[PDB]
From a paper:
Despite the lasting debate over whether GPR55 is a cannabinoid receptor, it is known to play crucial roles in the nervous and metabolic systems. Following similar discoveries by other groups, LPI has gradually been accepted as the endogenous ligand of GPR55. We solved the structures of LPI (16:0)- and AM251-bound GPR55 in complex with G13 by single particle analysis of cryo-electron microscopy (cryo-EM) at resolutions of 2.85 Å and 3.19 Å, respectively. The structures exhibit the typical GPCR/G-protein complex conformation in which the G-protein engages with the receptor mainly through its Gα subunit.
Author numbering:
A (entry chain A): 8 to 55, 67 to 230
B (entry chain R): 10 to 297
C (entry chain G): 14 to 62
D (entry chain B): 8 to 340
The structure:
Amino acid sequence: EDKAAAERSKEIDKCLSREKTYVKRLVKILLLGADNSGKSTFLKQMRIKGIHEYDFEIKNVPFKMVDVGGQRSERKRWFECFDSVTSILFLVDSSDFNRLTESLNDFETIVNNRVFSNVSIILFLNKTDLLEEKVQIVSIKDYFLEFEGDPHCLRDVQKFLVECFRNKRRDQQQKPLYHHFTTAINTENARLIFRDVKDTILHDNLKQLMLQ
Amino acid sequence: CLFDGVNELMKTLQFAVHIPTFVLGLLLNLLAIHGFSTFLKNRWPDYAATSIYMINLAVFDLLLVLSLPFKMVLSQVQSPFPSLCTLVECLYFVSMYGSVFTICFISMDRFLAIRYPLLVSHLRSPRKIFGICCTIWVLVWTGSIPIYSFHGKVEKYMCFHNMSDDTWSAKVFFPLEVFGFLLPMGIMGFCCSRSIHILLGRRDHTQDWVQQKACIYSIAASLAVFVVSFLPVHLGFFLQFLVRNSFIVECRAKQSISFFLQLSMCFSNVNCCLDVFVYYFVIKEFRM
Amino acid sequence: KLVEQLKMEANIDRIKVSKAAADLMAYCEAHAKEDPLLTPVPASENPFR
Amino acid sequence: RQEAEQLKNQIRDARKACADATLSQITNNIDPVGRIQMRTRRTLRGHLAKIYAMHWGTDSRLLVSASQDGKLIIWDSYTTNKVHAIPLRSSWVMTCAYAPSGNYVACGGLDNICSIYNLKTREGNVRVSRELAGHTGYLSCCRFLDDNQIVTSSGDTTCALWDIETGQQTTTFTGHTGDVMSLSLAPDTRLFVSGACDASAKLWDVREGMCRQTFTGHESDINAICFFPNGNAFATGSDDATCRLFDLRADQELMTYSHDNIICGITSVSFSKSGRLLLAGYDDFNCNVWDALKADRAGVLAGHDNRVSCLGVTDDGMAVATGSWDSFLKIWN
Ligand SMILES: CCCCCCCCCCCCCCCC(=O)OC[C@@H](O)COP(=O)(O)O[C@@H]1[C@H](O)[C@H](O)[C@@H](O)[C@@H](O)[C@@H]1O
């Protein structure tokens, strides 16, 4: 009887609509980073086979970290099915100078991709402790000739790295970029991620308010 | 006492201000309604909620503009039409305070979206905005009960003149001032100043906060016009109130207060043109 | 491996593009009247209309 | 290297010799189809995100669709009733398939696993029958041969034929250098053809596990592929806004279906039951119906609010279903 089929379709629609309030409030963050960036310790200190997913809650908000653990090497638009994510979170080993250029070369590929035009960028510079050791041993000028401050000051090297990452981003009028300098303790990164996502949602609201 | 020269000079200024105000406001508000109807028709699910109350504000300003010619005409020649005079006064004052309340609601919506971005990003839909617009219409027309009885049964229906001793009573004046200026002034100031503070405080979160620096100026402009459009009138109202309750007695003071009140009421109808500038034109270009 | 693949690919009994074209024409015309998209079906025999 | 060059030259010369005249030169004797009226007979609603794949049943009534909310939905196309709603373990689903018997469905995606679900269970619910693992890249396409044999194409440049009961790859099809995007079985179930991001397609025989022929001509990656109804030809759609009809026998391109005002890539292709209408979905929010024998854009299927990613034609040819990124499936007739 078609009456039973219509009823069953109705309970199916009710079940689907019960998850709309979750699909609309869910924040998906695409996590990128090289093997030396400390992704493992980062995820472990978040209190947490194809690609991986991690589900967690910050202040009654659901976050879903999508970790493309090596399968991002297929740099094709079909794989670039992450245009609906709220943020892209980069992990960069800031202390290991020999690879910053490589990291930058990766950054420029992701943020300037047309797919991620509506995605804000959160940038984490891991192993800041290994920075304060590395800065006093070697000069950042030995790898980047554009540096202008004193190479043995941590703050100047940090601002140089931040501007190096920010300068790889064309079209600086779409979405905000967030940078943080974090160590292996990593005890506050969920708070920082929540703050950056809240600011991204604020930016989207301002876009939606027609203020400019 | 004597009010002849004040009335003649003020009638001249009423024409001189309202005629350009009428034409410019009519044109600009028709363009604004066209543009935001264009935005809504596409059902862009970002611009619909804002476009609904921008349309509401434009409609209220358009109603005020349409009521302006009747105010110019019926205030010079006596009208043996109590119904027409009451209709004109209702259209004028209802449109003015509907614009005030729509502006206040725009500021409340901006402050809510800025201060509570998660909640607003979840619980904000075009149907709620349309419901709030309908509530504004219902409330502004409910507040128009006192304005069917300005002149009472007196046949001297010279529109917008010599209202009554009942209209200028405290029981009507204080609800008019508090719910017409002071409450929206406080809400407007709080929402705009807090939105400016919050959007400026984003320099500690990201270096891309400058992207929204324009969003500062617009909001600040929203205060500046709202203060200049509506502060002098209600203060003016206050002054005239003090005249009608035998608190101010001098003839020169009465003449100056009446002139200032009428001039202020003329100037606040320029708000129907300042609204399409503070809003409606701070967006990208508002492509015509 | 490439040489072997190309060797086996080359050894195929190809037909003229005109002949294959005629075959496609014949198949398209033979089943033309059974195609509900070339000739839309009235609502009396249309399950969606 | 010299032998490879000589073989390529011989193949191209045989292609030129066969190319005495093309279809567009001898099909002038056929009356053009004209301008086709297709209307939205139904609009299937319920998906919470973009729709990436659909597949019709062999009864021409049931329809499976896959969406980014992590769900397959099986619809009755006639009554719009949702027959089933299968939640997926992986919300990153790129393909879905429906068994010719209707007993099973399949899906896959960035999980590198082909999940096969059994629709005929005593308990009355859909249960995960198998999880075919063994592919290294993501899963791009998936097509049942029968209730126990399934062919899957992946982003590891490798295709495979799987025995469902065993769970292991029956045979492996290698030879592509880029990500294999699309897969189409021949309507005799002895051959299939795959498009693999190399501006090239390859034909593979199922039992021998060897690539019979390789076709080239495109400028970009091939996103979609399908066979002509008789199995003697196949059509590809790539990102250069160009459809191409190739012959199995002529070993070369037969037609190019391109137009000046279309520049976006092709997300899907399909044929009609007689094969005269080649339907292709485009990134520009609407589908186009081409006269497969005249390369003329004889119709347009507009009505989606986003990119048309899915396109399928019923086995009887009655209707055409399209799926787009706005979460709505539209049935057209
Ligand atoms: C919940 C929502 C709340 C709000 C809803 C919207 C409804 C608005 C209600 C409107 C209240 C009435 C406002 C009162 C002032 C006014 O309506 O207009 C001033 C002025 O026009 C009157 O002045 P008045 O003292 O009556 O007369 C003068 C001169 O008019 C002569 O020219 C003469 O020269 C002078 O000596 C003297 O007689």
